[PDB]
Each structure stands twice: as C-alpha cells, then as structure tokens.
Amino acid sequence: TIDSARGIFPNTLAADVVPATIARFSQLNAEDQLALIWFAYLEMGKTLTIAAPGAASMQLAENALKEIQAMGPLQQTQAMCDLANRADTPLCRTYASWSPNIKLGFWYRLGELMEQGFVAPIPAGYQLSANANAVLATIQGLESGQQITVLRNAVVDMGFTAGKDGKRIAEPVVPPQDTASRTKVSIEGVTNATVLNYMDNLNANDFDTLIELFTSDGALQPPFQRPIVGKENVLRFFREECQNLKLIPERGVTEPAEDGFTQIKVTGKVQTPWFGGNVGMNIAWRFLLNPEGKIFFVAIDLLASPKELLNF
Ligand SMILES: CC1=C(/C=C/C(C)=C/C=C/C(C)=C/C=C/C=C(C)/C=C/C=C(C)/C=C/C2=C(C)C(=O)CCC2(C)C)C(C)(C)CCC1=O
Ligand SMILES: [Cl-]
Structure with missing residues (x-):
C-alpha cells in the first residue's frame, strides 16, 4: 500500500523539529504569531534576501492587498489576525484559494509595506509571550533550510478553507526548458x-x-x-x-x-x-x-x- 511504503528506509532521520515547531507556533495568540514572524523575517533578512514574487503572482494577489491597504490601521491588524486565526471571512477564503507561492508573495508585499510604515506595523516595543519567545529561539537555532520551511508552513497554514472542490488559483505554468540547454x-x-x-x-x-x-x-x-x-x-x-x-x-x-x-x-x-x-x-x-x-x-x-x- 502507499501508506505502508511510507516506512521504507526507517533509519532516515527527518527534521521533525519543523512540524514540532509549527505545532508550537500554531498554539500562540494571533498577534504573537504575527510579531514572531515579523521578528524572524527582519533578523533573517540581515543575511538572506527573499527573491521578488513573480509578476503573475502579484497580479493575482493585488485586489486583496489593495483591500488591506485601504483599511484603517486597526482593521489592517484585525485582517492579519483573521488570517493567523484561520477565521472564516471573505479575505480568509480568498487567501485559502491561493497556491503557496501566491500566499508567500502576498506576505512579501505586506512585509515591505510594514517596513515602509504604510501598513500597520507590529506595535512599537512589542514583547512576545513566554511561549512565543521560546518558539522564536528554537527557529533561530535551526539550519536556514529548516528556518525557511517553518516560515513557509506558517504562511500556507493561514486562511480558511470552506469546501472540498473550491477554486484553486496558481501561477501560470512555465514552458519546459528547451532540450538542448538541459543539464543532467x-x-x-x-x-x-x-x-x-x-x-x-x-x-x-x-x-x-x-x-x-x-x-x-x-x-x-x-x-x-x-x-x-x-x-x-x-x-x-x-x-x-x-x-x-x-x-x-x-x-x-x-x-x-x-x-x-x-x-x-x-x-x-x-x-x-x-x-x-x-x-x-x-x-x-x-x-x-x-x-x-x-x-x-x-x-x-x-x-x-x-x-x-x-x-x-
Ligand atoms: C507571514 C508574515 C510575514 C511575512 C513572511 C514572509 C514574507 C515569509 C516568506 C518565506 C518564504 C519565501 C519561504 C520560502 C520557502 C520555500 C521552501 C521551504 C521550499 C522548499 C522546497 C522543496 C523542499 C521542494 C522539494 C521537492 C522535491 C525535491 C521533489 O523531488 C518533488 C517536489 C518537492 C516540492 C517535494 C511578515 C514579515 C509580513 C510578518 C507577519 C507574518 O505573519
Ligand atoms: Cl518553491
């Protein structure tokens, strides 16, 4: 069976600190979830730059981004908390319809706007909860490959899925590489x-x-x-x-x-x-x-x- 094949090579030690850390993060208060990732994003950006989101992706997220940018600060913060809490709202349903890359590009944009002060930032001098400070410490002790997987999984987990066959939005499919230029x-x-x-x-x-x-x-x-x-x-x-x-x-x-x-x-x-x-x-x-x-x-x-x- 497929489910039994999951057990081949049982010596392989996977980085289960990643789902462990996601499960701890998922317990936290929504505002602390947002602050913690802001914190982790800023620190990581000192030595690692995220690639810019593709144009198609940005177009697909643009309406939702505009909606948030048009809100007052308190509503902006509420909308971001809604996404972290997985509340059922129109914004959360739209977000859930998106492929991971589109969700990541949405938050890329919000991060830039928060850095610039045009979207309500984490409150100045914000202190994490006791559970959240320890979650961040674990994240910052991981290898970069684990660090980026924790961030992606936190992003993908947000929002609200209502339904089995809801619309799926993704970026357009790139044409395959020409056979001549392919490496082996x-x-x-x-x-x-x-x-x-x-x-x-x-x-x-x-x-x-x-x-x-x-x-x-x-x-x-x-x-x-x-x-x-x-x-x-x-x-x-x-x-x-x-x-x-x-x-x-x-x-x-x-x-x-x-x-x-x-x-x-x-x-x-x-x-x-x-x-x-x-x-x-x-x-x-x-x-x-x-x-x-x-x-x-x-x-x-x-x-x-x-x-x-x-x-x-
Ligand atoms: C959220 C948020 C923010 C922003 C956060 C931001 C902007 C975060 C951005 C995080 C980013 C851009 C993370 C990207 C991670 C990508 C990974 C782990 C890909 C792994 C791919 C693999 C292993 C694929 C391998 C594979 C192989 C080999 C196969 O053989 C088969 C295919 C498969 C795919 C399985 C703010 C900063 C604004 C603060 C508030 C807040 O909450
Ligand atoms: Cl990827």
Whole structure:
C-alpha cells in the first residue's frame, strides 16, 4: 500500500523539529504569531534576501492587498489576525484559494509595506509571550533550510478553507526548458534511469514527462505532508507548487524490495527559487519502483542535519 511504503528506509532521520515547531507556533495568540514572524523575517533578512514574487503572482494577489491597504490601521491588524486565526471571512477564503507561492508573495508585499510604515506595523516595543519567545529561539537555532520551511508552513497554514472542490488559483505554468540547454544530474552509486529521469525532468520543469514515470495509483509525499495519490493529483501538485526548483542529488543506494520492486534512497540538496543558491536544503528521496521501473511511491524528506546525508 502507499501508506505502508511510507516506512521504507526507517533509519532516515527527518527534521521533525519543523512540524514540532509549527505545532508550537500554531498554539500562540494571533498577534504573537504575527510579531514572531515579523521578528524572524527582519533578523533573517540581515543575511538572506527573499527573491521578488513573480509578476503573475502579484497580479493575482493585488485586489486583496489593495483591500488591506485601504483599511484603517486597526482593521489592517484585525485582517492579519483573521488570517493567523484561520477565521472564516471573505479575505480568509480568498487567501485559502491561493497556491503557496501566491500566499508567500502576498506576505512579501505586506512585509515591505510594514517596513515602509504604510501598513500597520507590529506595535512599537512589542514583547512576545513566554511561549512565543521560546518558539522564536528554537527557529533561530535551526539550519536556514529548516528556518525557511517553518516560515513557509506558517504562511500556507493561514486562511480558511470552506469546501472540498473550491477554486484553486496558481501561477501560470512555465514552458519546459528547451532540450538542448538541459543539464543532467549525476548520482554516486545510482544509474537507475527512472531516478535520473525524475531528477532531470523536474529540473527542466517538464511535468508532462515527469508524470509518465509514475504508476497510475502512485504517490508523491512532500516533506511533512501526506502522500499525494494518483497521476492527476501529483501532476496538479507539480504544476502549482514545483516550478523552478534546483535538485542537486549527490549519492544513493539501491536495494531489492518485495515482489520484484526496488527501493532507492538518494541524498543531496535542493534550492527553492525564493532563495536561489543562498539556501541549500538537505533532502533525501526515497523511491519504491515497481518491476517495470515506474514510481509507485516517492517520499521527499527534509533531513535533520547534514549528518543525515549518506556517508557524510
Ligand atoms: C507571514 C508574515 C510575514 C511575512 C513572511 C514572509 C514574507 C515569509 C516568506 C518565506 C518564504 C519565501 C519561504 C520560502 C520557502 C520555500 C521552501 C521551504 C521550499 C522548499 C522546497 C522543496 C523542499 C521542494 C522539494 C521537492 C522535491 C525535491 C521533489 O523531488 C518533488 C517536489 C518537492 C516540492 C517535494 C511578515 C514579515 C509580513 C510578518 C507577519 C507574518 O505573519
Ligand atoms: Cl518553491
């Protein structure tokens, strides 16, 4: 089953401090949630610059941003608290319809406006609650790759989803990289063509080729999230959330599994277009391939430390 395949390579130590820290953050008072992330954002910006949101994304968030910018200060603060509290409001429903990148670009803009004083800032001299100060301390002790994953997950969690098949807004799909200019990965130990083609197609934004590597019932499990099952949902996820990554796999190991299956573990690094080469996340991929080589299951794990990379 997909759910049992979740257990392959049980030695892999994932960075479960990330969902732990998100769960602590999610307990906090909404104003402290907003202050804490402001605090973390300012500090992090001393050494790491976030890439600008794409034009399409900004256009899609523009109405909502304008609405907030038109509010009085107290209402601005209430609107941001509504998003953090996951209140059911029109703003919260609009926000929930957005892909992660659009939500991130919305908050990018608000951060700039708060820095400039045009959107109500965190109150001057604000002191975090006892629980919130310790949450921030944990965040600031993590590796940058973990730090940025905590911030993304806090952003994505905000807002209010009412319904099963509500509208989904995402950025337009980029055209795949021309075949001529495509790079090929090299992985120590691993010549498996399905793994190599996985990595190379994702790096080229070639989602239609990538999806064809999977079994019809196959699943992909992103870090700290449940498996996404079947070709339509996995392709959806590629198109909405997996554009412009850079996968830098380094080494792997290849083992038999029950029934002519093969299990392969690869470790390496990943860069998100929000940070480019300044943040390299430590990642493992865990593949379960059927006898024909298609992908029945792949898990992508954020690793606890670089000491989890194979043969560090
Ligand atoms: C919120 C907020 C603010 C602002 C906050 C702001 C502006 C925060 C901005 C935060 C940003 C821009 C975070 C970006 C994170 C991106 C990550 C972790 C991507 C990981 C990708 C991975 C691992 C993908 C890997 C993958 C591989 C390898 C596969 O093989 C398959 C695909 C898959 C995707 C799984 C303010 C500052 C205004 C204060 C108030 C406040 O609350
Ligand atoms: Cl990303």
